[PDB]
Design a protein around this ligand. Sequence first.
Ligand code: SFG
Ligand code: SFG
Lengths: 309, 318, 318, 307
Amino acid sequence: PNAPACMERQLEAARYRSDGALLLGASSLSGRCWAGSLWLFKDPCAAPNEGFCSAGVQTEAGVADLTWVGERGILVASDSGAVELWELDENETLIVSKFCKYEHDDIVSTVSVLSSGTQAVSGSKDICIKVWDLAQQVVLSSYRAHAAQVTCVAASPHKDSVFLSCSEDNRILLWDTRCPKPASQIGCSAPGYLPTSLAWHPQQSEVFVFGDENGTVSLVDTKSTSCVLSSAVHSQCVTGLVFSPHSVPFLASLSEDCSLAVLDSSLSELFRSQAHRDFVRDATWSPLNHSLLTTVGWDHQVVHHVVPT
Amino acid sequence: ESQTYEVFEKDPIKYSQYQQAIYKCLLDRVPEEEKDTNVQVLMVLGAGRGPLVNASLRAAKQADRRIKLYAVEKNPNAVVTLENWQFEEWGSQVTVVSSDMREWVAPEKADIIVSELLGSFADNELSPECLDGAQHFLKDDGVSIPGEYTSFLAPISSSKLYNEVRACREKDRDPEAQFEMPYVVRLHNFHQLSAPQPCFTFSHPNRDPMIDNNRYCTLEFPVEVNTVLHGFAGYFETVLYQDITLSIRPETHSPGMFSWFPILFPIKQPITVREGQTICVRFWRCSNSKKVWYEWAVTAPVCSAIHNPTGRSYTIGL
Amino acid sequence: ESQTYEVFEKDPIKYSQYQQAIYKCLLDRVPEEEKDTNVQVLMVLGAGRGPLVNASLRAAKQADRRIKLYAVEKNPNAVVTLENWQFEEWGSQVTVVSSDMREWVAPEKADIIVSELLGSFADNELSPECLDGAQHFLKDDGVSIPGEYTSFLAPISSSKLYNEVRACREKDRDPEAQFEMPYVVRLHNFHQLSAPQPCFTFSHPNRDPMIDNNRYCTLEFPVEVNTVLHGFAGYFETVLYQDITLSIRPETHSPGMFSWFPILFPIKQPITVREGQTICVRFWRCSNSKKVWYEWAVTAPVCSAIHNPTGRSYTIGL
Amino acid sequence: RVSSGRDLNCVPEIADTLGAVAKQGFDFLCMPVFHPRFKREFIQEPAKNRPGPQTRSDLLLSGRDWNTLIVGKLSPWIRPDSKVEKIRRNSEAAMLQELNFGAYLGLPAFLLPLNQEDNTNLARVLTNHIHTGHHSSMFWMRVPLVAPEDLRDDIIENAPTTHTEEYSGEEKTWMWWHNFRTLCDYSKRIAVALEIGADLPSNHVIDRWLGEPIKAAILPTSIFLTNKKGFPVLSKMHQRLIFRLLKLEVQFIITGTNHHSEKEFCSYLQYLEYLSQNRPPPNAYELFAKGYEDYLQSPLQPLMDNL
Ligand SMILES: Nc1ncnc2c1ncn2[C@@H]1O[C@H](C[C@@H](N)CC[C@H](N)C(=O)O)[C@@H](O)[C@H]1O
Ligand SMILES: Nc1ncnc2c1ncn2[C@@H]1O[C@H](C[C@@H](N)CC[C@H](N)C(=O)O)[C@@H](O)[C@H]1O
């Protein structure tokens, strides 16, 4: 279907756009060739079958992370050190390269689109955080705030100059591009276990959740009583954290322990799935049916979960 | 290492012999009427980088028979070579197993077990122990390729090699340890004092209740010249299948086969031998829970000390 | 040897503690109503010359409960002592088993497993490995006596002991091997530089899927005096059952118990320590297919070399 | 002459990557032997039973190319000194798996990073690997001149960079190297791959590396300035250090992406080769003593012995 004959075993990302079409990211993390691919599935039940996709393209290196840019844009964090922008054509049958800018000195590990949707933030193993102008195809700001690999970058839902970043230097940084010294270290009470994932609350402007290398999920309020509230959700590191599209949002947590967990507002477990035979890499809630949740793993499984709301 | 496997693969004579032995065995197990109706379970035990897997495939195609291959390999590094070959070329026909053949829980029983676990003194890479462990997953009527191997010894005179061995004295170890261990060596400046005689023999499968791989052998070497005994040269011979053999024994040496150089068992003190006298040597294959080793001694014309008692200088890890 | 068992048996405190622990466990498994209606399967694993068998019998008689004893012993020499005791005194109540507890195929499952496989540094006689093998034939609700053990370490200053260790240099081995191995020693002329802290802990039964007896522990010893570090003194503590314990840790030392002297982990080079400084030491319990060993290093105030890497100087045979 | 190598953490196809690198003028390639993102599980089900080959086949290159053109790299997720026990255990198993694969390939050198103060368990795992068989391959310890915590931008308002001169603190990376080699009991197979930063440390910090076994110098593309013509160049201070490193005859490693995009990547190496060509010549003594550098001899006794 004008796309690559085979999609790579290690599925890295799953993201639903407004209409319900599924965007997939994959890398070959073994064998002769270590490359990647991007796929669109208007029928998400057909995923990961290559002959039943709406669109498909081969990237030169692996896909560490990706994000939708509006309704036709695909922003990619590459192993090459490049931040890539891809665009679905008029018919939405071809994924075409807009830009591929090699700005990072190591693997681009994390990418997030800012509130405006005209600017993006990238994090890398090169220890830098970059602010990008998507229209001008340039780096606006380069920040070396961390002292180790940058694990996660999460742009604020509504504040365009605000974003969160976490690193292997045990720092969780709150950013505000408006300040002369834009970063502020959010003290996780003492040293502790490294932060691995971040998710801004969709309603409470100064609230966010963060996952660690030990499997604990913690709930933070930027302006609260110093210490937070936590739950030991996983046996291994919390890879990702995704909030549901509901008025009262539920939080999906995915781990290297090969399980999925769905929690409530007070971090208590409602759903648990051991469907995956390898690492759970991404999670995306259906925009059409809010009780549905799709997960992708390194086991090459696209699993659709029926969450009990 | 990858380079060690690459140099084993440079010997075509070896695999052409293995292919021929597998081909011949396939025709004896499946008659022309059952040609493409019966599928033979073939297990390559210690598959390496896969040349024996390819030899088994070339043999099944030339015999026009059906085979289901298993490639057992303990070395995880070699498993990477195997799993890449499997995916790219072999397909579902070949099942790559990353396991010690002794520890492996087989899904099916085997018709033929193919292996190349032989050293310069045949059994010194512990082919007997390895194949004994794997014996359980072979069908009653099952064939082992190789079916048999025999080590051979001959007394040698060589003042150069005696000097070379002596020069292996190392700090932090018995000052005579170097004489109590074999050396793989392309013997050049030497003299064979008598004809090679068989030492230890192993047969596969081992159809006996109390299986014992321990051995004690006495060899009497008639010497027709005046000379000095400096050690014993070791060789081997193997029967892959029927008349298909491989040999490093000089008189019967497989032409163009450079996969094995001879072995040398030194003696701590040179022994004078007169014409008409017999050299008498005793060799023992020993073992415990964790190790296997050789012990040896010269009893005629004069005695030597028992070399490598309890494997104090040289052992083969199980 | 027979004399080694005879000196273990000279310590009454040890067996009176074991008897008491068995007695207490018997009352918790069998209530007064089921008194002489239910028979408890008790297995003495590493029964020796039988003092633990007699302790288990004294305990069953004092508790007024019914027991069926198994006496497992690998040492064939000790088996002769056992089989003679069995025939002359014990009778059919005691079943003498000449086997390694890890290899033994049990006819019944056990309610209680009693053992004394502890060294001066608790786990150094490989009690964990041995009991892990034997774990399968213990009933789900089954009790292991001892249930727990913990090793302890403390930094020591002793120029006499440093000189004693140094004097253990031997020919035919690494000239510093003597510093890379523990010594059982009744420490006399020494100075403890800080309080003992727990090092490695083991619990029986081991209710976890991926059982790992390997360990890595970091210990920080605050030093309130100026001094020289020459090694580390090792002790242990064990919980036989509930509050019934045995200890060689000096502060909690079981009164009148002389079955274990302390252990000494030397360091190749003496380390100067100033008042107010912390001594930081790292200990590792390592293992492979055939051996178990300790590795250790001092990282504060200055670094030492990693002592006994790969068990090159000292190993415990599996 | 100057021996040079290219450092990458992205090799989609090994054959063309090597080829492209050779075409740039480089003598060798520093690359991962396993995918840097391909985290592996050794204990827990179901992830421990992950199939397929664990990495690319050794058959992709000739034995000579593995032995002469490839320097191996430890995966960035391998953390033997993690405070998490599960991470520590998988990292021990992964470190051994990677170091053993490099041995299988017959790689001439293998890179390991000293990026923190505590590398005790990394040291233990490496000493056990050194004492397991032969003693050929080199181990290049990647240690920076200036710690990453000491070169971060002063952009965190509630955690400012220390403006107090800490003489001993500026020398923290040497003690990270020193502690590690002391622990590994001065193994001849353990050397320094010294990473040069944007801002050079104080002379005392540089002088500490005098006498240390430096076998490689890592030059990031980000430390280069741009001249009038738009080509990558170095500060006079940086040039001074390169000249000192050329006296030690180290191998130079170029890491990072192209930051001078209008030019070819080989321009970074062309500059390095120019500094190598424009270095002071050897005097009569330096010409005579050539080949005798750190070569130990017995002092001569013309009274007791006849020369
Ligand atoms: N018990 C064992 N389990 C599995 N493989 C074994 C065992 N013992 C030895 N091997 C393997 O057997 C192979 C022996 C090789 N010398 C021969 C490899 C291959 N047949 C060739 O001719 O290249 C090695 O790859 C060993 O790792
Ligand atoms: N795996 C094993 N299988 C059987 N017995 C063992 C095993 N390991 C150690 N033993 C025996 O356990 C005993 C340990 C003794 N130090 C104690 C003997 C006895 N409990 C006493 O206090 O005298 C020895 O007799 C060992 O032979």
